[PDB]
Amino acid sequence: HHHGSSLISKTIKYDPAKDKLITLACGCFWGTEHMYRKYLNDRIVDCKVGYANGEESYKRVCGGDTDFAEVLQVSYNPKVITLRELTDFFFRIHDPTTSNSQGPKGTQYRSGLFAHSDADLKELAKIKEEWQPKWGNKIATVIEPIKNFYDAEEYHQLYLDKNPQGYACPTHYLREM
Amino acid sequence: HHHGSSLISKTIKYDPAKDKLITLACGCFWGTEHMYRKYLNDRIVDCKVGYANGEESYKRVCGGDTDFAEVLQVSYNPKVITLRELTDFFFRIHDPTTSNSGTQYRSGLFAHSDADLKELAKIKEEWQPKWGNKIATVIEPIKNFYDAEEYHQLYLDKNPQGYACPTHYLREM
């Protein structure tokens, strides 16, 4: 029905009457999930790992489109925790600068913020600029409106192809084998 | 005192009278930790993330030697789960072949005994046909282990921001 259901985790706890979403790319998503759960589990509604890409202004990613990034989608109540606090945390749990951006080439691990609203896109761009003096080295984080999100397990099923063992997929998951 | 104390995680629950250790590399260690805890938590004693290398890229690994791998160290009671079962699980949670594909994310098994080294080599050989005989997993005696927190304190002393370290951890800034 093109109301953006393709942008939300199928399994995440989320009520649009009171919650908001933010989708975060900063390395292997089990790492991102560990950090948010370790430090902020009692202040977020839910989070789910998966793959996402953005409206943008080579090598397939685990059988899917070349631009997919490993992400954590976070559902939160803005009266409990702000987007600013969630984003400040993002900019402290990885190296978001060009010293960690992929140039040896696995783009699925890129630093990225996928915004679920026009207003969010603007606030995130502001927060990135405010982190630049502290990071010093050029921040590489891309900020894009979200275009697709799939829960991890769902994505592995969608792009199964003829590859149940996940050859050439660097992501941990229990293969069907 | 040169008895291999360094090869064990400082924080792991481990009793040498009944438990054994295996140190596993198969991607980012938070991924490896998530897999063992999600599926095998009731069958292992404990597990801890860190960086290890073994008795055998130019890029340093979070400031340390180029051969360090991100690993999970697992402590287990062989009467509750066997080394083979842990390794069978290892070979089903990642692509251990040359199609996948820094080097700290390589597939590897770091053995804590000579007997384990021989058993692991035999398991790898038995697994070859299922992975099209292209298993790239390195099997080596473990040479060093550092808790992730301890390694960062050691090789990132002058780099609190962890520039060029791909590992997730909370930078103090």
From Swiss-Prot, chain B:
Catalytic activity: L-methionyl-[protein] + [thioredoxin]-disulfide + H2O = L-methionyl-(S)-S-oxide-[protein] + [thioredoxin]-dithiol; [thioredoxin]-disulfide + L-methionine + H2O = L-methionine (S)-S-oxide + [thioredoxin]-dithiol
Superkingdom in the source lineage: Eukaryota
Keywords, alphabetical: Oxidoreductase, Phosphoprotein
GO biological process, one term: cellular response to oxidative stress
GO CC annotations, alphabetized: cytoplasm; nucleus
Keyword set includes Nucleus: no
Molecular function terms, GO-annotated: L-methionine-(S)-S-oxide reductase activity; peptide-methionine (S)-S-oxide reductase activity
The protein's Enzyme Commission number: 1.8.4.11
Root EC class: oxidoreductase
Gene3D superfamilies assigned to the protein according to its UniProt record, in alphabetical order: Peptide methionine sulphoxide reductase MsrA (3.30.1060.10)
InterPro entries named among the record's database cross-references: Met_Sox_Rdtase_MsrA_dom, Met_Sox_Rdtase_MsrA_sf, MsrA_MetSO_reductase
Pfam families assigned: PMSR
Other comment: Present with 3070 molecules/cell in log phase SD medium.
Primary role: Has an important function as a repair enzyme for proteins that have been inactivated by oxidation. Catalyzes the reversible oxidation-reduction of methionine sulfoxide in proteins to methionine. Also able to reduce dimethyl sulfoxide (DMSO) as well, with DMS as the product.
NCBIfam families listed in its UniProt record: msrA (TIGR00401)
Similarity remark: Belongs to the MsrA Met sulfoxide reductase family.
Protein name, as recorded: Peptide methionine sulfoxide reductase
Source organism of this protein record: Saccharomyces cerevisiae (strain ATCC 204508 / S288c) (Baker's yeast)
